[PDB]
Amino acid sequence: PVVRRARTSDVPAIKQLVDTYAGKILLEKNLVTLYEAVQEFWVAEHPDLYGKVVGCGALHVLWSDLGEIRTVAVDPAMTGHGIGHAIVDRLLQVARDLQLQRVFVLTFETEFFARHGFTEIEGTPVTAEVFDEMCRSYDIGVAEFLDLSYVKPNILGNSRMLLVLL
Amino acid sequence: DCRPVVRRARTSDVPAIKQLVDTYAGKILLEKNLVTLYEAVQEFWVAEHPDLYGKVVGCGALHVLWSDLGEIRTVAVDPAMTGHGIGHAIVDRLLQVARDLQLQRVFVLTFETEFFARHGFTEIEGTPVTAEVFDEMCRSYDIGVAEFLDLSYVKPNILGNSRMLLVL
Ligand SMILES: CC(=O)SCCNC(=O)CCNC(=O)[C@H](O)C(C)(C)COP(=O)(O)OP(=O)(O)OC[C@H]1O[C@@H](n2cnc3c(N)ncnc32)[C@H](O)[C@@H]1OP(=O)(O)O
Ligand SMILES: NC(=[NH2+])NCCC[C@H](N)C(=O)O
Ligand SMILES: NC(=[NH2+])NCCC[C@H](N)C(=O)O
């Protein structure tokens, strides 16, 4: 499937994908914060219909060398057609374009991301000096990566996976 | 005089960007710590130094605020390189990406009224969004959005600044 960069017109559709997977699975993102993050988002168009989008995804930078894959959602009726994998394949390519070395994921979909080289891990792989700089973030997804105390109850059960690049 | 290359930022550029933002502190620019610069690297732009290959002498960023609305934020140039056309080369680029995003209006909160005027910006009053959108935008964790909404707790941090806007 075609994986293209998101457009402000795509936000209402993107919002519906995130809301579909609610807050237990995906981290909720309100309408404004999606319009602000539109420049790092990607969407998969339906293989036949030109306009409609069936999947979204975003690469979030966390530091000099570290990136994250977040807010990956596919229409419940379109899963198992390779869409989600087509999104990750491109998201990882832009991670390369960004000269990143490690890509993080916090998810229940261990099997899904495993097919891209992701291995499950424990802890936060950053220096305490770097850890201290990231505590200063206003972004919740960063806090879930740092396993900060005030987001812990929202992410128990999720697995921490990581990918290294050539 | 030379028009400098204005390219997308790279994670290696963030430390340099951090010194430019820090240079203009909180009196002029809204301060941005190191992590939020690495997170925003995909919307940031930098002007390369006409002489040093790696180092950057100016930065700038376009932040989308809604379907049609964008903002230009954290635009800074080295004090020793000011008045050499860099900042306008950055703004010219930021506005081009606003078009590629199919935006219609671009907002600015600044003291540099004449600077942005050279691009067609006109001064305004208030927050130009529907009250329905205003309510959706109140939910943001970004301080720059709160300053666009003229929220009460940031008022003392922006007193004196002018609100300008550009239409495409
Ligand atoms: C974040 C926001 O949204 S607010 C943005 C404002 N930020 C700030 O003011 C931070 C403090 N100020 C600054 O950092 C700087 O003033 C900047 C980065 C905004 C602009 O700096 P520079 O680009 O280097 O100055 P620049 O070379 O573009 O020209 C400044 C003036 O001199 C003129 N100009 C003078 N000489 C030249 C020249 N050789 N070439 C091109 N333009 C020139 C410009 O036309 C311009 O006139 P204008 O203000 O009426 O448009
Ligand atoms: N708040 C949560 N339920 N978080 C679980 C992990 C969310 C995941 N990191 C994402 O991309 O959305
Ligand atoms: N210190 C402030 N918040 N000043 C108000 C203007 C902020 C400026 N537009 C910026 O992007 O940084």
CA A29 to chain centre: 12
Q: Does any ligand 2 atom lie closer than 6 A to the CB of residue A142? A: no
In 3-state terms, what secondary structure has residue A121? strand
B3 secondary structure, DSSP code: P
- CB contact, 8 Å: A60 with chain B? yes
Chain A residues in contact with B102 (beta carbon < 8 A):
7-9
- CB contact, 8 Å: A124 with chain B? no
DSSP H or E stretch at residue A87: helix A83-97
Do residues B147 and B163 make contact, with C-beta atoms less than 8 angstroms apart? no
Of B88, B70, B66, B79, residue with least CA distance to B6: B88
Q: Is B153 exposed, middle or buried (0-12, 13-18, 19+ CB in 10 A)?
A: exposed
B68 with A40: Cβ contact below 8 A? no
Query: In whole angstroms, how large is the CA radius of gyration of chain A?
Result: 15
> What is the nearest CA distance from A80 to chain B, expressed in angstroms?
30
Of B122, B144, B148, B123, residue with least CA distance to B134: B148
| Solving technique | X-ray
Q: How far apart are CA A107 and CA A84, in angstroms?
A: 14
- CB contact, 8 Å: B42 with chain A? yes
Chain A residues in contact with B33 (beta carbon < 8 A):
133, 136-137
- The backbone torsions φ and ψ at residue A78, rounded to the nearest 5 degrees and listed phi first, read -115, 5
- Give the tokens for residue B167: 């239409």
CA triple B94-B143-B126, angle to 5 deg: 75
CA B148 to chain centre: 12
